[PDB]
Design a protein around this ligand. Structure first.
Ligand SMILES: *[C@@H]1O[C@H](CO)[C@@H](O)[C@H](O)[C@H]1NC(C)=O
Lengths: 48, 48
């Protein structure tokens, strides 16, 4: 009952859908407790 | 440091007159507005 806690994923070109490796990014953000140093693009238009 | 934005205002004035600190009128333009969001209490300065 002594075990090492960590092992490889056996990722091979023959693995099935879902058994394959998938890349993951998770966008968290924390908000409004201080000024919003990020926003997306606001659009612009011709100056008539 | 106000509303979570920090603001540097400044003027450069090449007074060649030797005496200390002039009386006469001029005003600081705003240089920089920064979203730094930090509380503050004191400051220090850097000399060569
Ligand atoms: C700034 O000061 C107040 C009062 O101590 C505190 O409630 C607030 O959480 C502080 N902000 C930060 C970023 O520590």
């Amino acid at each position: 009952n002594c075990y090492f806690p960590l092992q490889s994923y056996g990722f091979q070109p023959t693995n099935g859908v879902g058994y394959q490796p998938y890349r993951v990014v998770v966008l968290s953000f924390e908000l409004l407790h201080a000024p919003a140093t990020v926003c997306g693009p606001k659009k612009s238009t011709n100056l008539v | 440091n106000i509303d979570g934005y920090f603001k540097i205002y400044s003027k450069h004035t090449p007074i060649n007159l030797v005496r200390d600190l002039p009386h006469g009128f001029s005003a600081l333009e705003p240089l920089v507005d920064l979203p730094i969001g930090i509380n503050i209490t004191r400051f220090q300065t850097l000399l060569a």
